Amino acid sequence: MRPRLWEGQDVLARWTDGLLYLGTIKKVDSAREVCLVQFEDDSQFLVLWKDISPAALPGE
Numbered sequence: 001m002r003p004r005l006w007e008g009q010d011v012l013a014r015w016t017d018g019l020l021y022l023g024t025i026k027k028v029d030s031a032r033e034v035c036l037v038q039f040e041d042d043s044q045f046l047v048l049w050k051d052i053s054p055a056a057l058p059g060e
């Protein structure tokens with residue numbers, strides 16, 4: 001998988017409004033290339049891998 005993801009990792013997920021929302025990975029599905037993500041409002045959704053990035057930005 002292009003970005004390495006794992007349970008409990010803090011991630012930034014691109015939503016349908018084009019914005020990045022902070023959340024936490026609760027499960028990883030490398031076969032369907034989605035992850036269960038729980039966001040700041042404690043809501044959970046299946047997010048496509050392509051819309052996910054580590055909240056840790058390269059170069060810090």
Ligand SMILES: c1ccc2oc([C@H]3CCCNC3)nc2c1
Nearest residue numbers: 013014015021039041043045047
């Ligand atoms: C990708 C898929 C679903 C998503 O849901 C959210 C948050 C939007 C508003 C606050 N609750 C959840 N960001 C997402 C990114």
